[PDB]
Design a protein around this nucleic acid. Structure first.
Lengths: 348, 347, 347, 347, 347
RNA sequence: GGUAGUAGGUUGUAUAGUAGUAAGACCAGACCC
RNA sequence: GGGUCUGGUCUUACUACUAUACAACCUACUACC
């Protein structure tokens, strides 16, 4: 079996997610909200924040994938257009990460299996923890496959250490959250470029993941530069930031935001609540009054960022550097002068 | 079994009403409307005009009673509060005639059978064409029963000739639309008073049902009064109406409205779109410009109104007359000038 | 008093319009609709078709002016921006004809009297049938006044014969629907130029109002032109229309539309459902398949149009003619070929 | 170009449809409606009856095709999935006939030209009155092409005489509404089989289009059968209908509905307000009280139906017959009693 | 430019605010939300919390002023009715601080320049960081001007040290957030009276801004009174509060709320979520169970409050004191028992 | 495969119009000396 | 006159988007050989 609204609301009440049980409960749809009658009084179950019909969004929300899944920004950069036999929920905007589905909800299904002709000119995200998905990936023309283990005959690419889990990014210990990504385009397997993976942290629950980050969060600006020999790289403005003018200067690393936040709180107004490798923030410092309209904030490991900034020659007046980050080319504006860098920020 | 929204929408697509088939179709709920996907394009099935939730109203609309059922105004006057194992749809306002149901929709059900203790202090409408409903009526404490035939041990009351059928009032010929009404209050059967029944016609599809009405619609005002001896009864103003002043005078019979409509069209703005014995209209005549704020329009057979107006006993200046219409008392405001009748309109 | 939502809904139930009685009834607001509880079941009272909040629109709808009032297109052309102590309801779009009010609804009131300083730079519509409104007009800086009779010290301008009444346009007989319009700008009384008034008819309920119109609707095209000597005026295309090409030719008079409609039905899709002197229609003929994107249809008396078309002074190839219609200037695009008239249509 | 909401609303105000002019007007989006500010007051331009966003539907509505276009049922049966560089508006449900577009609205565009790789596995409707569309059809892998004239190297198929025009079906005289249909599947041109075309009439504006229909609407049932020798074909029940039982018998031709409507009015409640070759109606006769839950009503020319019914080869008790109507297969449920025909109705 | 919805949404995506760039992006309006299509999936850009149409509010939200602007409570007390060539966004209620605009959005614009006749009887907020605004202020009849520097020929009034910046109140260091306010009424420049400015702090992110506040938050109640000689001023109840009875006693300073919050948490339910000098809170203490229906909480610097309370001149039993706070008069209800102060709270 | 013709994706050129979170310069305004 | 800070413009170097014009590559559809 039964695929109906009242059966879907039964599983939410008893199991929090669509498991596949049989049962029905009263459902009342008012505005975009989906209420249910428990003990004679209406209890709200879900408020629709999406662009889909009220009952369509609720059915996709219940059938979301609760297993550790790749972060949405990884999928978007890989070119994933639809998810096979599952729905990947984007908790940043409370909407499905893909407009269409495959064998999930009859209202939005474009097919019942990922092997149909309609799904051929689409990159389909194939899981690896579900039996039979690996075989479907080989036969599919365009698809992206993730596997905790290894797949014979294919060269794996090690993905990010952290992965999304019910909207919470974490480096799994009990459950392995490090997947191997395989990309197949036009029936030909393509190896993914050697890239640096974003850690995808946040200011509030910020914890360093390396010795260099711990020194950055504890030592002074001058001491940190001297210890790691960062002279002549504009590390004072690129990462620490310049809270001295009417507009913010630099501050393009999420680690730099965390250090400033602990000193003085501020608000990061995100005008595009989606998940992407490069985030734009409307940063407004609450102490110095410094605000910047667009602030390209990219969360990179401090060890990798030092390696990146030291792998580029600084003789040119300016240059655009293409760096593989999260399996995509990020445009870095390397504005330098006389060897010493002036700024280094991404674009998105 | 299955009682779900997608199963209900399947029966509407294939059978127009909830029959009880098994199947499911895609359903999209946008605004108060309930759309379905047919041939890859959304097709509207129902727009919610009610006060109930979107899916609750749609489930009641599909489970409506398609058999000939009494007009809603009859049920309201009889004191009916809920319908047993069925939903009586009021097409005048596109909403269920009763707020609660019995064993219809789990969202609004107050019980699954009409014999529970919660339904005891409520007048429940019991059908007669469904087997077992007659037995439930006897055991029920408060209830109203309709039967095409006769029920042993009970004194029937002959109801109106016409009955509602999918929102269309008609005097059935192939199907008998004349029921016998039984009322039971506090466990004691009460006989219903002898009453006149409203014909419940309309201006557009107006057809006379007696010889006197045909003469009224064809003959002149003076000729009709002379033939039936209606002198000294204010029939010129009560029924024909007075389209000569800033406000309309009289015109309190639906038959009088029909005659004027054929001569000159006008609009009857009903500010309370419900079904009742006495209707109030915001009548605005389009020829003479005469408008009346409140116009109590009651549709009565012209033979009965003449019978009532001749039994009126015009001897006092003002009097309120209680007339049993549709199993209920209706107060008619009567004003009589010395010599004749001035104005006779319901309140 | 008391000015509250539940008191306003009481007057609608009992009197159809806000009279000023004291009382309260249950009110439930769902979506844009305003329901009320009568006999235990919700009954819809009003559905909001405006851009205003649900309860604000319902309060303005109940306080609408039910007396014969000027058509909305007259007020818009006169420059009326707000109505004093009343609401003029525009039934074409089911929304108030003016965004703001004066002493009507506290949610939208900009003042409680039309004499305040805020209302000074606004043209306020002053009635004449309400006592004291004439005095307010004299003291007001900008205002438009209508009076059934005459006002001392002011030169009246005779308005249109027909006037709106509960959304129905009519030439009143019992109630005088011909008003005298007075316009005052910047504290100086301005007279209004002589104008031809549009009859504002419609295709369905079309009735000729002159002998010439009766001949037009009955006689043939050639016979009508010969009798009234309309040769050399393009009357075959301007009024009758040309249903022979891929696009419609002419047909810019509502009387011409009516004659074609009786012969062959068609649909007039109005993409701007408002009331104005010149109407644009998306006409699609159902017989010949002729359709025109924009068709400027103006309803004028055929006698007046003949007078206008014979006072055009056809001497130049092209000329724009300013004609005072409904107290406003209308630009008519005139094209004349050497010898006769080619095409004369409004812009 | 400029493609924005405020530019689209400018063309509707000035030209009724998106022509491509440059300009902007104020736009206010409230509920599903799209209002505009004209003379300081909001005027409704369009109410969204579709599932698309408010501004997306309004942009598609303005960019609709106003030229004579094939009826939607023809396109659906031909397998058309998207329209190239145009939007075909389905006036039956007030929604676009195709979910996606090509180079129309950036919100719903899947491509800017019909030659892209994404549009290859889709049947694209190519016009013929627009220059360059014929060349695109040849290069396209899947597509359907209509042409008023002829195309070299392709075998034309004569389409229906009538065609939609702003929601009005008509047999064009000034503008040729008879197109030649070409279907190309997988890069191989396929010839369209011969078929009969539904006239798509309606009960209210019903006009016979042949001598046989005139006899049907005028002569009696017995006389019509005798004249055209329809004995032994159940024409009394199939077309005329049987208004004698609790359920309606037969009445599966729209011409039969029209004859009954003129005799006695009734209501056809359509529970799926879409446009299709076979329509299902919830017919309720207002005279005899006969109602049928599902009534498959197909509007066919009476001359063609006589030819269809005689070509049946009545030799088995029950058989499903596949008939090519409107470029699609229609399954007719045939029941034959030993000796004659019992009932022949579509499913 | 171009002023359209799709161009406005382009600047939000690329620059977070309307800068004036040229470009268009897909926009979908569902409910009150304004979505955009990025990488094939809809991304929410703005949810309308105002009373304005969906697209009108989104256009005003994008065109908000991101520079340091005066707090909304300062503007309301100064009598500001409209903002010239900019929109001042009130982040407390997520709605524009002024109903109308000037040259911002064509849907709500009452003029394109602040020098028009319509804007004359309105106090217009003129910026000082935009070139040419100072000249417009001189020519304007009613207006309020803020300037970081000084303006020749006018006497400046030093404003509050803190100013709003993207909804965050702060004392700017890199950017000067201390403005000079000029008020002009009826063409005559009026000097503003000396006043005390509210600090506008909050319980969670509470940081003392003076030595006296630090002593208040650290030292005991008795010790703090003795050190600053606050005996005979009811400082125990006015500021510290009395959490001993069924209703809260005193606690009318935001600094007093902060000290209690650190000791025992509680909830301040604000039933009027707007920004004003005097705030009313539905305070419910979670430890002692003490709750007060209305608690007038005004955030004042403790140094300034001590100066006020030491200049109160406690000599009468009851007196209403007018104190100039935030350029407006505030009535403080003062009750004094013989010998000391009983209660001193604002009304 | 060629010619006589109509075309879509990739790339390049030309005339243009905008942008880019760094820096420099010019003009205007404000503050201080 | 100098310093600092804002509003407007230009420049530095590299790239992105939109409009028009032209060419090349990969190739698509008809007429004839």
């Amino acid at each position: 079996l039964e695929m109906s609204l009242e059966n879907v609301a039964f599983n939410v009440v008893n199991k929090g997610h669509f498991d596949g049980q049989q049962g029905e409960v009263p459902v009342s749809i008012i505005n975009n909200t989906v209420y249910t009658k428990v003990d004679g009084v209406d209890v709200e179950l879900f408020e629709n924040k999406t662009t889909l019909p009220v009952n369509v969004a609720f059915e996709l929300w219940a059938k979301r994938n609760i297993k550790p899944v790749p972060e949405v920004k990884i999928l978007n950069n890989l070119g994933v257009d639809i998810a096979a036999n599952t729905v990947i929920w984007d908790y940043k905007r409370d909407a499905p990460a893909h407009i269409s589905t495959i064998g999930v909800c009859s209202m939005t299904d474009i097919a019942k299996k990922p092997t149909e002709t309609i799904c051929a000119p689409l990159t389909v995200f194939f899981d690896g923890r579900v039996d039979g998905q690996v075989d479907l990936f080989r036969n599919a023309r365009n698809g992206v496959l993730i596997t905790e283990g290894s797949v014979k005959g294919l060269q794996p690419s090690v993905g990010p250490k952290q992965a999304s889990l019910n909207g919470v990014t974490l480096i799994g210990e009990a459950v392995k959250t490090q997947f191997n990504y395989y990309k197949k385009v036009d029936g030909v397997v393509q190896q993914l470029p050697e890239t640096y993976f974003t850690q995808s942290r946040n200011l509030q629950e910020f914890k360093p993941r390396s010795q260099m980050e711990i020194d950055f969060l504890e030592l002074a600006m001058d001491e940190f530069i001297e210890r790691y020999k960062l002279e002549g790289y504009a590390f004072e403005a690129i990462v620490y930031g310049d809270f001295s003018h009417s507009q913010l200067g630099g501050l393009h690393l999420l680690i730099g935001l965390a250090k400033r936040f602990k000193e003085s709180p501020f608000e990061l107004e995100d005008f595009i609540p989606m998940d992407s490798t490069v985030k734009n923030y409307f940063i407004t410092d609450a102490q110095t009054g410094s605000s910047k309209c667009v602030c390209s904030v990219i969360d990179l490991l401090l060890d990798d960022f030092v390696e990146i900034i030291k792998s580029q020659d600084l003789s040119v007046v300016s240059k655009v550097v293409k760096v593989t980050i999260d399996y995509t080319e990020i445009s870095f504006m390397l504005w330098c002068k006389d060897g010493h860098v002036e700024t280094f920020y991404p674009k998105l």
